[PDB]
Structures are given as C-alpha cells and as structure tokens.
C-alpha cells in the first residue's frame, strides 16, 4: 500500500478542510461588517483560493475580528500542501535514485566481497597444496 | 538530455495547459456576470498570470460559479511549475554531485583494487617460502 498517497493525497484532503473552513467561518463572520461582500458562502468561495496559494485578488475579503484569525489558518495550509507535493515528487524521483543506490552498492559490494573471496580461495588452494607437500611425502 | 527535459520541459508544457484552460474557460464563463471584464480573452490574459504565481492584482477576475473551479486549476499549476524548476536545477547540481561521486569511487576503488590484490601477491609469496623451506631443507 502506498504510504506516499496516504501522506500526500491525505494532507491535500486535509488542505480542503482549510478551504472549507475559510469560505465558511470568515464568510459567516463577514455578513454584516462595514464593507462585507464576503457575506455569502457560494460567492465567498473565491476567498480561501487566493489565500492558500496567496494569490490575493481582492474581490472577496473580511474586515472583522474573528474573520481574520479564521483566515491566517487558510494561508498556512496552502504552504503546508506545497511542501507535501514536493515530498511526493522526491518520493518517486528518489525511488528511482533508490533503484540507483541499491543496484550500485549491491553490485560493487557483492563484487568486491567475492574479490576478497577469491583471494581466500587463493589460500585454500595453497594450504591444501602445502599439505600435499607434507605428510604425503614423508609417508 | 535524459528524463529531466522530459520531466521538466514536459510539465512546464502541461503548465501551459493550465494557462490556456485558465483564460479560456473562466473568461467565457465571465462574458455576462455582474462585473465582467474577464469577458474578452485578449484582455483577460492578465488573469491567469496573477493566478499561477499567485500575484493577484485584481483588474481581471471572475464572480461566476464555473469560472472559479476553472481558476483554482490555474494557481495549482503555478506551484507545480515551481517544484519542477526545483527538480530541473537539483538535477544539474546533483548531476555534478554524482560526478564528484564518480571521482570519489574511482579513487576509493583503485586504492582498494591495486594496493589490495597486492596482498595476495605476498600471500603466495610466503607460501612459496615454506614450500621451499620444506623441500629445500629436506629433499
């Protein structure tokens, strides 16, 4: 099971909870403030879109007190979702770089180890050789 | 020229499909909304520029329903191309980190190869010594 899609496609769905808590709690607290067009929810939906990605147009925004603290929470998730998307393109770009690391070190190591090995056999062949010169020559 | 330009110059061209589906669909759905100058395409082009990079000026933007969902798609590609120009450069400088890695391994290897097998040279060396202590001293 991917734990990259339960990390990226799981904090991008938690990102929508900051896009649905931005045109929902700062649009309700914007239905009667001096200069409130962020009144309706369906119309103040273009609000938490220019907040997250911090595009910031201006056709939708608050002027209240508790409509601003429920706004700064929206631009925080926008950045929280950008570092996450970054973490899933470095999960599969480095999983390729991971195919690299495993193929390289497993090749050089198993290869070198056996190079040590051969050296050892150099020994065996030699010990056995000497043995033959040994006991089998005196008796 | 590997899957770098087919990764970078392939998602920056998929970026243009969010710049051409952003002054094209949210500019058509903006030709009769209360406060529509995002009507004309040639004039509503400064729209998907302030969306992607999330500059967000305000002289061009929608108030419709299906002119907003075809807008959030534009600022998404703006960041996607930022994580991309991020992968193109890390490709360059780590392509030099994998080059210094080439020098590193060849110096670590050639020093583990010739000064190592040199031991086997002597392994036999001392073996030929007893092969000779025995039948140089006995027969």
């Amino acid at each position, epitope marked *: 099971s991917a734990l990259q899609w339960r990390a990226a496609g799981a904090a991008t769905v938690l990102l929508v909870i900051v896009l649905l808590a931005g045109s929902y709690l700062a649009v309700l607290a914007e239905r009667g403030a001096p200069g409130a067009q962020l009144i309706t929810y369906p119309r103040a939906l273009w609000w938490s879109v220019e907040t997250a990605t911090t595009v910031g147009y201006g056709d939708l925004y608050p002027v209240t007190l508790w409509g601003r603290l429920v706004a700064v929470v929206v631009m925080v998730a926008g950045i929280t979702s950008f570092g996450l998307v970054t973490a899933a393109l470095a999960t599969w770009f480095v999983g390729q770089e991971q195919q690299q690391q495993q193929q390289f070190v497993r090749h050089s190591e198993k290869a070198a180890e056996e190079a040590y090995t051969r050296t050892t056999r150099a020994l065996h*062949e030699r010990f056995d050789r000497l*043995e033959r010169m040994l006991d089998d020559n005196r008796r | 020229s590997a899957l770098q330009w087919r990764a970078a110059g392939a998602a920056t061209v998929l970026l243009v499909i969010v710049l051409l589906a952003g002054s094209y669909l949210a500019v058509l759905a903006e030709r009769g909304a209360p406060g529509a100058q995002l009507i004309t395409y040639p004039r509503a082009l400064w729209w998907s520029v302030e969306t992607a990079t999330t500059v967000g000026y305000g002289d061009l933007y929608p108030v419709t329903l299906w002119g907003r969902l075809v807008a959030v798609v534009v600022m998404v590609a703006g960041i996607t191309s930022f994580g991309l120009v991020t992968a193109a450069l890390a490709t360059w400088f780590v392509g030099q980190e994998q080059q210094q890695q080439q020098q590193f391994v060849r110096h670590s290897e050639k020093a583990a190869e010739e000064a190592y097998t040199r031991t086997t040279r002597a392994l036999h060396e001392r073996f030929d010594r007893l092969e*000779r202590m025995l039948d140089d001293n006995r027969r």
Partner: antibody
Amino acid sequence: EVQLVESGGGLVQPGGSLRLSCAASGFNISSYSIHWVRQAPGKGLEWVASISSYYSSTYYADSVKGRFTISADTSKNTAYLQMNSLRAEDTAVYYCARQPSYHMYSWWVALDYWGQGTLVTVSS
Amino acid sequence: DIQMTQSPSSLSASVGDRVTITCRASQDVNTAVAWYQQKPGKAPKLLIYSASFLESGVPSRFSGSRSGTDFTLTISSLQPEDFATYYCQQYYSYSAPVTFGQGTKVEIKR
C-alpha cells in the same frame, strides 16, 4: 566409467579463433582439474593451459599468453580451451587430461586419464 | 618455472634387455615427476606417478628412481610390446604441474 572427450579441433587460417571442449564423463570436474596438452604434429608432448575448477584457478603455459583462455562450466560438465590469435605453430593434437586436485593423496597421481584429442590445423 | 631434460632422445636395444632412462630437472621437484609411455597414434599412458610408485595397472618391469633432482625410469626384462616413446613429466611447480621432457623413443634393434 570414466573417460574424456576433446571436440572442436578443426581448420583455421592463421590468427583465427577456435574453441575446444573437453567433455568429461566419469567424475564431476567440480572437484578435479583439467589440463590441455597439445602434441605438435610429429614433434613432442607440450602442455598448454589447465584449470582447477575447484579452487577458482587457471594456469597457462609461457608459450601462450594473451591468446588462450581455459575456462570451465560445471553446470554442464566440460572444460574449454579457447584459442584466439592462432599462429601457424599452434597446429597439433590437442588432448586434455585430469589430475586430482590438491586434496587427499590423489594429487600425487598427476595426469591419470587423457582423452584422444582433436586436431587443430592452423594454416592459410 | 621448472625445466626438464630427458635422456636420451632415443635408443636401441633388443627384447629381454634392461633399459634405463634418466631425466634431470632444473630445480627442486621433490617427487612430482611422472612417466608416460606413448604408442604412436594413441594418447600417453601413465606409468609412474610419485616418481616412486607405479599406476594401478602397469607391468611390474617398470621401475622409478630418484636422486633429488635426477629421476630414472627403468625397464628390467624389456618385452616385445614396450616399443614406444617415453615422456618424463613433473607436477611440482606452481606454473601448473605439467612439464614434460624431450621424450625418449625406444625402438628395437634386430
């Protein structure tokens, strides 16, 4: 019932290539060593290269160096002497024989059983 | 890299005779010298292996000797079918174990 089988000798213009195969048949070459000994045509006995497939070793004669390559596959059961830059003097009767490796006392018998040999004719 | 000098090239003698072939080495072999009798046409046959003992199927008339460096094959009571070429080989060296000498060819004198 042991015996050896050289195969592959033939006719090759000088500086050509050839592969002889010493098909073994009574023992596992796994624990034995295969020699390749070529007698010239009408001249005396000469050793070329040998291989102890048990230790991971090989040995070639000073008569041939960058040209021959004795090697062996144990999955099948054969040794192969590989000839590459065949000179006009490489023409001969190529035999192959065994000797036990360095193991018990058997190594002291040396070229215990030979095969009949194949003829290699190097000439333009 | 050990060398070998057999002796002599060839020889003449009648059957029932006593033939002795020497070989002399260029270095210390201990007892890794072997004797082979080859009958024109077929491959060599093994005669003596430790330069001391003989193969498990050889005429008892074949004897091996050693003087540290000099080895000598000897055939007491030479028969009528011992007419072949004889090769003295050694298997002590660490080149490989093979090295044969210029062989001796025993033809008969009638």
